[PDB]
């Protein structure tokens, strides 16, 4: 009885693979072979933000492109002003094993979570704990706001969840993965999202329905980071096999691979520039690499951290980049 | 305006300095063990969908915080990375039960990790009385899992406890050397293993932890002053 279903899965997979190969007539490399490159790219450190006591796991820019929130494992959330390096807020957490943070698009709330399996929500404009969300059975690894009353979370119990905050009830659940979900990203229209896990695959989910649209494979090991293209029709991922890859939603297959023969360490973070022409990646060497997206050439290096780079971010106007690592410092590059 | 912002920033900095002064003086420990081990009994011998638990105690006016893991899954190659800067790892093993190969494999995987290769381990071999009763019963053999035990002799430089039978000493020493071989085989020269024999009625484990942490901090001091 089980063998028949396994066979059926086999023929279905073969049909999908054949139909997918039937559409690949050219490559991205052969179509961009006749464009002028970007050249060499220099960036310089403008600010250094000091004040944390231990590792830094997460960051998130505000929508005004001025204010930051950062999370460390001494048990602190700090909210910074970046033009003047002032401190605006410092929030102590009840559990110190925090792993993610987010900033509300209206600027009124922040959120965090970690090894306690609870997502906590703080109100900034009254700082007291506004609410706590409980119901996952594994550590919380990511979270992003949709508006001031909805939130989407990913856990290390192989499921995603969508929560309504005022009632405090888990209103939708997204299942289908087989390993720890490690990252999320919201589409620019905020009606779809992609997730990636430790089974080496990525999935596209419809928010309004609760069902998976598409599955993407091709990596060799666990996937740590994920991001959308500014257009909303493609996305890029990074893994522990020391490789980045670019996939397309409409053609339903991989488009490009960014890798080098002297890089044998995993990738912890990815991000796009404002026009989508550069791709920035944070590494376990100790530093960051800047790639050309349309020709797969390495264009620049950002160096200057003394430990493992943990997180990156680019503002909503494209003016600056912010990087944080395990040496307890945040740096702003321009 | 600007003056109010600078004033608020300075007040926050004062509070942060106060917090750091007390953060730097506490010792954090991570506790690991399997279900068949008596780990909860050990944590219950200390006097001062939830994911993690903490226990606080004090010895000689020194503060210890010890952490234990609650509702997680089997996979642990992602959340272990959170514990790269703890002072020590306390590893509990049930020495009367076999499942010893699983314990040895766990210890070998913990010892050689990339983000945990500067952290020292205090090893607790639990349930000594059960092992003694099993050895004296004579209905079970150790050559069924570790054949090399057939050709092992207790060293002449041993210091047995007064009153123990030779057989119990031989079994004890073989089992301990099994873990010490893994500890010394790779190594780094930058971290050490401290083994102890324990039961469920001992009132000496807090003192043992105190002493080993004293030695760990002394070694780190000697390394930072460039003397060893």
């Amino acid at each position, epitope marked *: 009885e089980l063998d028949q279903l396994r066979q059926e899965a086999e023929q279905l997979k073969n049909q999908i693979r054949d139909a997918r190969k039937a559409c690949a007539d050219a490559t991205l490399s052969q179509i961009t072979n006749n464009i002028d490159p970007v050249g060499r790219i220099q960036m310089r450190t403008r600010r250094t933000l000091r004040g944390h006591l231990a590792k830094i796991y997460a960051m998130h820019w505000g929508t005004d492109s001025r204010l930051l929130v950062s999370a460390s494992q001494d048990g602190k959330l700090i909210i910074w002003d970046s033009y003047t390096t002032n401190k605006v807020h410092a929030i102590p957490l009840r559990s110190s094993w925090v792993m993610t943070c987010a900033y509300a698009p209206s600027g009124n709330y922040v959120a965090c979570g970690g090894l306690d399996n609870i997502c906590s929500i703080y109100n900034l404009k009254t700082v007291r704990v506004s609410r706590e969300l409980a119901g996952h059975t594994g550590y919380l690894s990511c979270c992003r706001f949709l508006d001031d009353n909805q939130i989407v979370t990913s856990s290390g119990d192989t499921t995603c969840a969508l929560w309504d905050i005022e009632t405090g009830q888990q209103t939708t659940t997204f299942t289908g993965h087989t390993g720890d979900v490690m990252s999320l990203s919201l589409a620019p229209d905020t009606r779809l999202f992609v997730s990636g896990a430790c089974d080496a695959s990525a999935k596209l989910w419809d928010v309004r329905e609760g069902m998976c649209r598409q599955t993407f494979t091709g990596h060799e090991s666990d996937i740590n980071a994920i991001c959308f293209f500014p257009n909303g029709n493609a996305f890029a991922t990074g893994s522990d*096999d020391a490789t980045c890859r670019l996939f397309d939603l409409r053609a339903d297959q991989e488009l490009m691979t960014y890798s080098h023969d002297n890089i044998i360490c995993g990738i912890t973070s990815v991000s796009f520039s404002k026009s989508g022409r550069l791709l920035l990646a944070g590494y376990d060497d100790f530093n960051c690499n800047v790639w050309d997206a349309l020709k797969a050439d390495r264009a620049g290096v950002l160096a200057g951290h003394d430990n493992r780079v943990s997180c990156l971010g680019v503002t909503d106007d494209g003016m600056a980049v912010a990087t944080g690592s395990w040496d307890s410092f945040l740096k702003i590059w321009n | 305006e600007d003056k109010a912002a600078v004033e608020r920033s300075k007040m926050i900095e004062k509070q942060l300095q106060k917090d750091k002064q007390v953060y730097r003086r506490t010792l954090r420990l991570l506790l690991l063990g399997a279900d068949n081990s008596g780990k909860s009994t050990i944590v219950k011998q200390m006097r001062i969908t939830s994911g993690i638990f903490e226990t606080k105690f004090q010895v000689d006016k020194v503060n210890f915080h010890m952490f234990d893991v609650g509702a997680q899954r089997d996979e642990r190659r992602k959340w272990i990375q959170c514990f790269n800067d703890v002072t020590a790892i306390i590893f509990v093993v049930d020495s009367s039960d076999n499942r010893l190969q699983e314990a040895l494999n766990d210890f070998k995987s913990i010892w050689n990790n990339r983000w945990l290769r500067t952290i020292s381990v205090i090893l607790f071999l639990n349930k000594q009385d059960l092992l003694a009763e099993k050895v004296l019963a004579g209905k079970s053999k150790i050559e069924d899992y570790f054949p090399e035990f057939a050709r092992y002799t207790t060293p002449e430089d041993a210091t047995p406890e007064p009153g123990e039978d030779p057989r119990v000493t031989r079994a004890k020493y073989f089992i301990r050397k099994e873990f010490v071989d893994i500890s010394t085989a790779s190594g780094d020269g930058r971290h050490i293993c401290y083994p102890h024999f324990t039961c469920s009625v001992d009132t000496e484990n807090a003192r043992r932890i105190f002493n080993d942490c004293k030695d760990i901090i002394l070694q780190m001091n000697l390394r930072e002053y460039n003397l060893v």
Partner: nanobody
Amino acid sequence: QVQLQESGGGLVQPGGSLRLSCAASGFTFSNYKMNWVRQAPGKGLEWVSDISQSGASISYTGSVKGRFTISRDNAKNTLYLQMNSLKPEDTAVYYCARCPAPFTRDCFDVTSTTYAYRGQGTQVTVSS
């Protein structure tokens, strides 16, 4: 797509011999370590044997030393286990596994839950 496929298995008399093979596809076979694991009727998952990336280092459990041998083939992307002098206490389902990351010394999680880089397994029975 990572894929592992095992072959061999069957029913043998006590004191017999067998040779299991495994074919791997979808990754650089020569960058990883390889593992043989087994599960018995009514028990959990148990580690059986270990081999490194260049074939230099080998490792077995105490209860199989002197009877089982592990071997590697990088050009053909194949792993082999040779079992001699079978006992009735070897009746089990065998699986092949590889470590989660390349160029590394520590190993994977031997877990009942869905470990993504394990095969379906083959059945071996030793009885008369």
